[PDB]
Subunit: 125 residues, 2 copies
Amino acid sequence: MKPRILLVEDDEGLGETLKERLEQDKYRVEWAKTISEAENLYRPNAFDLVVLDLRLPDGNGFDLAEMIVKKEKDLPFLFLTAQAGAQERLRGFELGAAEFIPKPFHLKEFLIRLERVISLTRPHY
Amino acid sequence: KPRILLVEDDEGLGETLKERLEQDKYRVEWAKTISEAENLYRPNAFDLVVLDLRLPDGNGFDLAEMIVKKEKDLPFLFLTAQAGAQERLRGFELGAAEFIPKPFHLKEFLIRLERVISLTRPHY
């Protein structure tokens, strides 16, 4: 019912804040702090959206995204990252990212953009 | 054909964008100042406004605010080097459909613009 988000983020100050605010009313969040934890949490037909940064301590978010796309072609993923230059964004969009949100950001911006991504996951009425 | 109001004073860029979009079966009215954009803008004529926050005769937020007052659900997006956290927050809170920073590769802009154009308006 509540969309389930896989959040991949090693900054625990930011990750706690994001998880807490997302779980406030609308969403359920499984929060991985490493790529290996993300891989453990990840399985097909379990998530509605993945939110990930690019650098984690044990690998790169693009590789994780590429893996996920291979297993579940239509699982939306968005990047949330300080590495948000023209090249990174183009790479993300060409891989089919649903969104690309830079750091730094205000939480309310993230919530607006994320709610529109969730809206696109809804079926046609 | 979807009609785009492009508000962009950089004429090298504006020419490139107008030409490519018109090859993609868009109609583009390209304004180079806020003054010109306000003059070209009319309700029930455009399907998307693309504007820079940085225009020669003022702040693109003023133009976006005028457009929102007149046609609250008209899609608009910012294409701008003024792409920091405060400006993006203000833009999304105002209802911007997208916010694409400069510099950008043209293919990124096209991918993101095509997505905005696909959204349904208004409520069926």
